[PDB]
Write a protein that binds this ligand. Structure first.
Ligand code: CK2
Length: 294
């Protein structure tokens, strides 16, 4: 758009190309996203407009929504790096626990805020968790999923990851709750600790079975109503639950306790962001400065 000079491509997002750009009338650098063909439905417009209001220090700020020439462009606050690259860059020694705790703690704050407003992300992943040079981490593209039906394969033909998708979704539950974000965050939490994705599925069934292999195949005992779900199949293999001390060493007892609650099968039993913030694991949280090299 006229008022923006693209400086470079930051990547291919789920909803279109993302460009780092500079606003010509303010001089601020931002993250510009182009979305999508009918002319953009009113519904999408109102949902997005609502997002312009839910502001929080741990939520990437939506600066402007430009609907011109029947095209949708979203302008977001710009952050220099995502957790994905940061992790890859910290593969040798891993992200220090104090920093891991700080990041998880802030993410939960952002989630508690959005959830209190009944707004969920639905697609959390390292790629949309942005960090700055001041020890902060923020949630990006919050709420866009409900605004636009999330596709299986991006416009760039890139395969969208299922690694962080909650089991209720894999099983066909059509009414996701805020619990899906807690699950995603728990998977990411585990990944930061072990430096390896928790459930690297490459298909829905592979994703589902990897979950079943680590946490045990769910039944009516641990998850009432599981067998009545759309994609549940009595013929699912019956695996035993691995013990967490084996799944996320060397995370301490508090972390493992908290991770276990963020990973409960039953969405209703899964800990909320709010309750999570009061968990003993955060007893000694601090805000360390990351070693970022831009
Ligand atoms: C793909 C991309 N996804 C996000 C979330 C990107 C980004 C990069 C920099 N700043 C912002 N807000 N967003 S680029």
């Amino acid at each position: 758009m006229e008022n923006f000079q693209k400086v470079e491509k930051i990547g291919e997002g789920t909803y279109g190309v993302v460009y780092k750009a500079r606003n010509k009338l303010t001089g601020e650098v931002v993250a510009l996203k182009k979305i999508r063909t009918e002319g953009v439905p009113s519904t999408a417009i109102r949902e997005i407009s609502l997002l312009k209001e839910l502001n929080h220090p741990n939520i990437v700020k939506l600066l402007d929504v430009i609907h011109t020439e029947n095209k949708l462009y979203l302008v977001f606050e710009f952050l220099h790096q995502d957790l994905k690259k940061f992790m890859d860059a910290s593969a040798l020694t891993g992200i220090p626990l104090p920093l891991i705790k700080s990041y998880l703690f802030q993410l939960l704050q952002g989630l508690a805020f959005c959830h209190s407003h009944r707004v969920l992300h639905r697609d959390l992943k390292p790629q949309n968790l942005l960090i700055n040079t001041e020890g902060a981490i923020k949630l990006a593209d919050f709420g866009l999923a409900r605004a636009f039906g999330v596709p299986v394969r991006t416009y760039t033909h890139e395969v969208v990851t299922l690694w962080y998708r909650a089991p209720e979704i894999l099983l066909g539950c059509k009414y996701y709750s805020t619990a899906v974000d807690i699950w995603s965050l728990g998977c990411i939490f585990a990944e930061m600790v072990t430096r390896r994705a928790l459930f690297p599925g490459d298909s829905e069934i592979d994703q589902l079975f990897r979950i079943f292999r680590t946490l045990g195949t769910p039944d009516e005992v641990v998850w009432p109503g599981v067998t009545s779900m759309p994609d549940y199949k009595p013929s699912f293999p019956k695996w035993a639950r691995q013990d967490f001390s084996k799944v996320v060493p060397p995370l301490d007892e508090d972390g493992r306790s908290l991770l276990s609650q963020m990973l409960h099968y039953d969405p209703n039993k899964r800990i909320s962001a709010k309750a999570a913030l009061a968990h003993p694991f955060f007893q000694d949280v601090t805000k360390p400065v990351p070693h970022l090299r831009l």
